[PDB]
Amino acid sequence: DQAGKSPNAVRYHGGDEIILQGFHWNVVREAPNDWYNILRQQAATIAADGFSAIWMPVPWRDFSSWSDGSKSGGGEGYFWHDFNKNGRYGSDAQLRQAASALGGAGVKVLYDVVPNHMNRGYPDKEINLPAGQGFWRNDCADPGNYPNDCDDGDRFIGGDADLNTGHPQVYGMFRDEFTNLRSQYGAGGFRFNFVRGYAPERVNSWMTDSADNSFCVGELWKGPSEYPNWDWRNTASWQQIIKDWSDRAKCPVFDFALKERMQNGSIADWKHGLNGNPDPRWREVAVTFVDNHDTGYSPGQNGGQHHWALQDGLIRQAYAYILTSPGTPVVYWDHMYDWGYGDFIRQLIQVRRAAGVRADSAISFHSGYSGLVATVSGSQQTLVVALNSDLGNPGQVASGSFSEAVNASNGQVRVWRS
């Protein structure tokens, strides 16, 4: 496991990670207080499957609850009240055991952290920040969903639970928790939630202070149309928006550019995500995914959130693409362990590793065939990927001797190695 910073000092940890998203939306409902036991028991399996890191749920206890019609939720971690680890996923003791098992098996543990807001109204919590001291966004005049003097980012819905992450004392509080997670809970890095809610630069500061050499990823989900009309971003590509955040936070960013193309474009257009960018400084910072707990379905209740879910007919194609291309891929718990795509994903992980494909590997797209046809220059081997294509043989598009590595869904998914 190579472990440096990119040529632009972005914390991609060598550019060779393969991450497993360690949970789905309904875990606290389906395996109440048992999740960490489940991960401890699966640790060896996860490690054997080929994952170098696991994205853990928010460790901070969440006893929130909400409901609007048919839809209900809470306790998943995004509306935590204090840093106590005895939450709905399991106890502090179980977390430590879980993190120890994962780490023991060579899997780095990445924690999901929510610095933007907290469950302000929770009657029994260990963290109580009073009003009138500048700890909250609403300690200042709050016009709309725009930075105010108490919060240099967007607000979460109403903004009444938004923290002034820039307040010396709030910053310091998060800083200390990140260091704790690293020193007693075996953190190898963090997944930053709702990155639109506070300054990119603050993420860099936090990383510098607590885990400079760790892996980090930011969740920036905000389209061009969400920026003000006078902002350059209102007319920029999804790629430029996430790339800009990454340059400032010095952390890799979720490829929402690729996700938007998977949802709205044709398969041939998948070449427009950040990870397909001809400049390695651009594609190496992309953190690719097919679905997550927000965008995809989850076993259980209401099918989870499914805010921007990939149709089942493209799941295999979607995984074939992210596992064989540049950037850093993320595999969704469910596709891997619930829905039966596990064997298929296992195969591709092996292909990725044997070819020596990494964050900055070169990718070329071929224009003369239907579907998506790409040539990937791994450090060990060259890959020819043809998805929903009429391509006849790898030799039509690449020089060399190729063997078939993957052939699934009636040739809709084909991968060849040199």
Ligand X SMILES: OC[C@H]1O[C@H](O[C@H]2[C@H](O)[C@@H](O)[C@@H](O[C@H]3[C@H](O)[C@@H](O)[C@@H](O[C@H]4[C@H](O)[C@@H](O)[C@@H](O)O[C@@H]4CO)O[C@@H]3CO)O[C@@H]2CO)[C@H](O)[C@@H](O)[C@@H]1O
Cα–Cα dist 22/57, whole Å: 7
Query: What would the two tokens of residue 262 be?
Result: 């998977």
Do strands 108-113 and 53-56 pair parallel, antiparallel, or not at all (unpaired)?
A: parallel
Residue 151 contacts which entry, ligand X, Ca ion, none (Cβ below 5-8 A, type-dependent): Ca ion
Contacting Ca ion (CB under 5 A), which of 151, 284, 291, 334?
151
Q: How far is the CB of 263 from ligand X (least distance, A)?
A: 15
Q: How many CA atoms lie within 13 A of 396 on its CB side?
A: 15
95 binds ligand X, rule: CB under 6 A: no
- Closest to ligand X by CB, 218 vs 378, is 218
Amino acid of residue 3:
A
In the beta sheet, which residues pair with residue 298?
none
State the helix-helix crossing angle for 342-355 and 315-324, rounded to 10 degrees.
20
Neighbour tally for 393: CB within 10 Å: 12
Residue 14 contacts which entry, Ca ion, ligand X, none (Cβ below 5-8 A, type-dependent): Ca ion
Q: Which stretch binds ligand X (CB under 6 A): 155-163, 265-273, 347-355, 380-388?
A: 155-163
139 binds Ca ion, rule: CB under 5 A: no
Q: Which stretch binds Ca ion (CB under 5 A): 115-123, 237-245, 286-294, 324-332?
A: 115-123
Contacting Ca ion (CB under 5 A), which of 22, 75, 115, 153?
153
Cα–Cα dist 325/348, whole Å: 11
Sequence-separated (6 or more) residues with CB below 8 Å from residue 84: 60, 61, 92, 126
Nearest to 76 by CA among 67, 63, 93, 86: 63
3-state helix, strand, coil in the chain (%, to 5): 35, 20, 45
141 binds ligand X, rule: CB under 6 A: no
Q: Where in 154-273 does DSSP place strands (E)?
A: 187-192, 215-218, 253-254
Cα–Cα dist 251/195, whole Å: 11
Q: Which stretch binds ligand X (CB under 6 A): 96-104, 125-133, 158-166, 332-340?
A: 158-166
226 binds ligand X, rule: CB under 6 A: no
From residue 345 to residue 384, what is the string marking binding to ligand X with x (rule CB under 6 A)? Answer: ----------------------------------------
Report 1-40 residues binding Ca ion (CB under 5 A): 1, 13-14, 16
321 binds ligand X, rule: CB under 6 A: no
Calculate the dihedral angle through the C-alpha atoms of 108, 209, 246, 168, rounding to the nearest 10 degrees. Answer: 130
- Closest to ligand X by CB, 193 vs 377, is 193
332 binds ligand X, rule: CB under 6 A: no
* Closest residue to ligand X in the complex (CB): 158
158 binds ligand X, rule: CB under 6 A: yes
194 binds ligand X, rule: CB under 6 A: yes
360 binds Ca ion, rule: CB under 5 A: no
CB-based burial label for 174 (10 Å; 0-12, 13-18, 19+): buried
Q: How far is the CB of 4 from Ca ion (least distance, A)?
A: 8
Report 189-208 residues binding Ca ion (CB under 5 A): 197
Q: Residue numbers of the site for ligand X (CB under 6 A)?
A: 64, 66, 73, 78-79, 114, 156-158, 160-161, 193-194, 219, 221, 294
Q: Residue numbers of the site for Ca ion (CB under 5 A)?
A: 1, 13-14, 16, 116, 151, 153, 162, 197
